[PDB]
UniProtKB/Swiss-Prot annotation, chains A, B, C, D:
Assigned protein family: Belongs to the transthyretin family.
Originating organism: Rattus norvegicus (Rat)
Modified residues annotated as 4-carboxyglutamate in this record: E35
Chain sites annotated for binding L-thyroxine: K8, E47, S110
Keywords: Gamma-carboxyglutamic acid, Glycoprotein, Hormone, Phosphoprotein, Secreted, Signal, Sulfation, Thyroid hormone, Transport
Section covered of the full-length record: 28 to 147 of 147
Misc remark: This protein binds retinol-binding protein at levels similar to, and the thyroid hormones at levels much higher than, the human protein. Tetramer dissociation and partial unfolding leads to the formation of aggregates and amyloid fibrils. Small molecules that occupy at least one of the thyroid hormone binding sites stabilize the tetramer, and thereby stabilize the native state and protect against misfolding and the formation of amyloid fibrils.
Gene this protein is translated from: Ttr
Quaternary structure and partners: Homotetramer. Dimer of dimers. In the homotetramer, subunits assemble around a central channel that can accommodate two ligand molecules. Interacts with RBP4.
Any one Gene Ontology cellular component term annotated for this protein: extracellular space
Protein name: Transthyretin
Main location: secreted
GO MF, any single term: identical protein binding
Chain positions found as Phosphoserine: S45
Annotated function: Thyroid hormone-binding protein. Probably transports thyroxine from the bloodstream to the brain.
């Protein structure tokens, strides 16, 4: 009933949840390379859920890339960052659910982790 | 040696120093009151040097008040916040040298403090 | 949704929402002072809904203030800030719903506003 | 700074500069690959001045990598992010002066640039 991975994104310039920011989730392989894990556009309210399956999202290193640049390039603003990425290692270690947050601005971005534990 | 108290502001939209920002400083009189301590404007580098010396800067709660509204407003952007503040106690756990840094954005902002003992 | 003013606080140290952080919303009266408006403390989720009804939240400037001082202090960390204040004008025009978010850290905080609207 | 790439890393939990934060700067390649551009750590000023020269800092896509995991780890704290990366294209205007800041906390970091001009 709940997926671990989820992204939220806000736009600090117009007090708005950034919509349609492109999200790409990359999972670290055995050899030490990256393969695609999930992909999607931020919905109309900032959130992007139903990204992975509560069982496909297994232990490992991850990297969420939010294409922040085309987002700002779309409204007349040339951004600093080429994009924004978030590397963490989700795990079966517990604290099984995660939501990544973004506070996007032309020359600055804060990223927030928020892990939770369901009822075991 | 360094400034017992300083302020620096940034522009998350232009990727640059917040220039010419009014900064008022008030000190709480032990009875509730807030009396004028100092004030000034952020120079080109975004900083604001000289707010007080150690002799003046005393143990007690203070309040920095950067007028974020007049700033964006002078550009054409109607910001959310009326102004911005940082309320804190100083010199109580010892006379230190503070630095209140602030990141501005029309609908969002951040302040951070670096507490530094003098060169002693 | 069916709530005009909500506040969502997060805890950057713990990686979970800042639970039981006492909020105190004031409303500037016509005389110029701050008459009590709403007042609660973060529910487990780190948020607050029933602060006011969609009719009580009239056009005017407001002051939301979070007691970070006691939050951090109940965990043993002596924060820098005395509290966290966000005065904004809720000129109930294009947008009726407001969401004041804030990320806490012992020496740094970040507020942001998200003003959606009664869409359809 | 009078040299091209200067990096500044503070601490939201200790309100102090972040010293010994290993920093690596890469450079995209003609093959879209990533050629190794720089290495260094943050001094006691939680600032790293000692990387490139205007002469050597050409136009291109960079990726500054801040080893946040080792930082939080040495202190006993257990972080979420593995690294903090600032990927930006540079000098596509005639080589300017860059400054990257990073505010650190275990479950959320924040980066911002300040594009300066030596002549202008």
């Amino acid at each position: 009933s709940k997926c671990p991975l989820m992204v939220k994104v806000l736009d600090a310039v117009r007090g708005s949840p950034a919509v349609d920011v492109a999200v790409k989730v990359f999972k670290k392989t055995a050899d030490g390379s990256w393969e695609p894990f999930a992909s999607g556009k931020t919905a109309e309210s900032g959130e992007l859920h139903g990204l992975t399956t509560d069982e496909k999202f297994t232990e490992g290193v991850y990297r969420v890339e939010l294409d922040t640049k085309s987002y700002w390039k779309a409204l007349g603003i040339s951004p600093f960052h080429e994009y924004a990425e978030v590397v963490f290692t989700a795990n079966d270690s517990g604290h099984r659910h995660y939501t990544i947050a973004a506070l996007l601005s032309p020359y600055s971005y804060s990223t927030t982790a928020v892990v939770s534990n369901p009822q075991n």
